[model samples]
Target: FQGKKIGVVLSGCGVYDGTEIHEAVLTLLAIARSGAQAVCFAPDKPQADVINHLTGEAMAETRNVLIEAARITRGDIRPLSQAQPEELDALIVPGGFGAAKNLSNFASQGSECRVDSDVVALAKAMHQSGKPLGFICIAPAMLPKIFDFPLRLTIGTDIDTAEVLEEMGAEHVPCPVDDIVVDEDNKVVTTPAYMLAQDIAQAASGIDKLVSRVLVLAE
Candidate 1:
């Protein structure tokens, strides 16, 4: 059950900076503690310093709470993309503005919404390879531009980014803020960001439940 390795991709820095750091860290912790290896990778741009300042501090705090540590990697969002694609149980992108700006938010949203090529390529490859890939917050905006298959995805918050998705002929749903949406049919998973009572307990439970679910699927 613990044989699978999950991959998480984060953007460099700036606008793509992520949210739910503590929850994300706990999520990784739960993955590691469950016996699956948790591997992380970020783009290898010149912005490592900024990335460190933005993500490093929160990661440190997460470390204090978690028993297992995350193995951070760098560069080529495609190479370490999905931990061997077919072998990966799932991939997760925790949300941030970087997802919108770095990912173009949605082409319909104007030129600034053109989207990030690297993110589109990475997410597309993972989904095409039949791995269950998930996102939190505004990250799903990057998927439609990259995938040919119909994606069963939702946003991280109740706020609808459903326009482009609807235009693209994809399914969009409004999930309970606390519920994590898993579409086994489409091989995509998702969750909302502004859930209620986001304490350590809720985060830990989320990690435990999701990791265990993935482990069973992996086996």
Candidate 2:
């Protein structure tokens, strides 16, 4: 349990264009507090788009996923191409539009989304090796595409999102911001972070549960 390495797959840097900062930080905090090591990784590709967090306007600039993600991990991150799932005990993906836009095509393609090949490979390896994975916020949107069969996960109670997940081959389970959905058979855990949380505390509540459960499953 103490040495369990949990891979934290990041998308970008903010809720609009990248990984939600709070969600990412909370995940790391939870993992460290749980006595597990948090290793960050992101795809080495241009982001689908960049947004001005202050103005909420689109920017005509490009940023690499792995580069921007390093800001969250304080430069202690790696490119997804280098991630070896067998080296990790578990995995967790924090959400943002980046999760939908960069990590996978869910933001633009919905049920027909395509995930990054490296991300898919690592995730598959981890799952095949019986390592647990956790998804937070809208990151769960990519689960259906990641797994061969329909997965049971949550993205809070957003009906539209739930419908999209169902269409994408997942069993949409409506969970609260302070709760998590665990697919024991698949060794997957999911929580609706900013998807429903009005504050960081609410998001942390679910993430803490997810982190703890993932570690236990890793054991």
Candidate 3:
């Protein structure tokens, strides 16, 4: 708490193609409630695509990851390019197709995906500095590609996706929606969030655990 800087990586807005609204907001609340300062950020680039969440349809338009994320953070966000990993005690990325689509090509390329350059830089710095990193929902799928070594992470109980992540080098751990998987040696925390959550509260339970653990690791 007491001004411990925690960085949040947002994808965009909405759940279909962007950051999951519930996950992002819940994470921000958990950070503040635990007395840590949350620094929200996102890549300053066009989203992979747009979606009409109303009818689960595709839309023909362009949206910037950084611009749309502002709506969730209420304009209190920064570009991922401007992030200085040394400034944050920890970093977290909430789930949505946006993270996979915008920050990394995981949504389309799977094991062949390459994380966004800026994201890799910041996350790599944090990893080398021994700072904790949290991943929620589908965000954990990005882990194997971000780090050079294997990590203990989760995305609920999806066998298909779990196999893909394992193939990418992460040791997939099947998790409950309300719990988190922590890799102490790697200083990484991951939760299922919307991945298996039946509702908003279910996701929060896991996210809250992740935040608390990250704060503890920060110390």
Q: Which whole-number lDDT from 0 to 100 does residue 7 have in model 2?
A: 95
Error of 1 at 69 (Å): 14
Q: For model 2, name the residue pairs that clash.
A: none
What would the TM-score be for candidate 2 when compared with the true structure?
Answer: 0.98
RMSD of each: 6.8, 0.8, 0.7
Q: How many backbone clashes does candidate 1 have?
A: 6
lDDT of each: 0.54, 0.91, 0.91
Per-residue CA lDDT of candidate 3, range 32-63, in tens? 99888999898888998899998988898888
Distance from true location, Cα of 205 in model 1, Å? 5.0
Q: Name the weakest run of 10 consecutive residues (lDDT summed) in model 2.
A: 84-93
Tell me the lDDT of candidate 3: 0.91
Order the candidate numbers by TM-score, best to worst. Answer: 3, 2, 1
Query: Could you tally the backbone clashes for each prediction?
Result: 6, 0, 0
Task: Rate residue 68 of model 3 by lDDT.
Answer: 96
